[PDB]
């Protein structure tokens, strides 16, 4: 592929990705163990059943986007799910390709591996891609295909039909009175997996939702241990 179609692709990915997990009339799948933690589904025409996460995650949005944009290399340092991440080529506007191996959830949802074009920007509440003042920070992915990338007969290839990471900030007051930023945290998954049928999926896809969420809020805790947030 020419860079302009892949920029494309990725254009074209990161607004369905800001369509869809913005959509109304999501239908409860699973509720995590923290206040407000909930894994929905919904029907998207093109798309089939789409999964999103959302909770709140202490630490200011910004910091969370800066580490998913610029150091996703470093995702298996804390997220024992993702087993490895490689930057394939960096192709402009925050565009790029990188190849990630996942671990495995319940037996459904075995180790895959993924070529993924990405997008990350800052967003208006309109979608609209800004330089600052956001009112979202968006990580979009789709799977495409990449010479030099060929399926390994040793490991699914995964396929990403649509995602996001979406980030909004918020300052809330603590219970002691003190003014902090926190973060909504939003992530909107879609996978081609076979004949399991939809209810076994469906288990399976919240339920690692949810368990990624745990490396994250300890990835947070360390960082605000060590004073960085």
């Known amino acids: 592929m020419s860079i302009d179609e892949y920029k494309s692709q990725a254009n ?20 995590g163990t923290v206040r407000g933690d909930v894994v929905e589904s919904r029907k998207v025409e093109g798309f089939g059943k789409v999964y999103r996460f959302t909770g709140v995650v202490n630490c ?13 290399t470093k995702l298996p340092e804390w997220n024992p799910t993702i087993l490895k991440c490689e930057i394939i080529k960096e192709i402009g506007d925050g565009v790029d390709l990188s190849y990630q191996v996942t671990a495995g959830g319940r037996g459904i949802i075995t180790p895959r591996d993924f070529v ?11 979608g609209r891609v800004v330089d600052d003042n956001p009112h979202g920070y968006i990580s979009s992915g789709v799977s495409v295909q990449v010479p030099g990338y060929p399926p390994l007969k040793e490991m699914v290839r995964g396929h990403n039909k649509v995602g996001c990471w979406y980030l909004q900030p918020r300052t809330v007051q603590t219970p002691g009175g003190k003014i902090e930023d926190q973060a909504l945290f ?6 081609d997996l076979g004949k399991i049928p939809q209810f076994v999926l469906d288990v399976a ?11 994250v809020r300890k990835f ?10």
């Open 116 to 126: 993924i074009l990405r997008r990350t920007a800052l967003l208006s509440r309109e």
């Open 12 to 31: 074209e990915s990161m607004a369905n990705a800001w369509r869809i997990i913005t959509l109304p009339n999501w239908t409860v799948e699973k509720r």
């Open 60 to 72: 200011p949005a910004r910091f969370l986007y800066e580490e998913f944009k610029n150091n996703l």
């Open 220 to 229: 947070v805790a360390e960082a605000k241990a060590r004073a960085e947030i």
């Open 205 to 215: 896809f919240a339920t690692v939702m949810l368990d990624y969420i745990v490396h």
């Open 186 to 191: 939003q992530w909107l998954m879609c996978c």
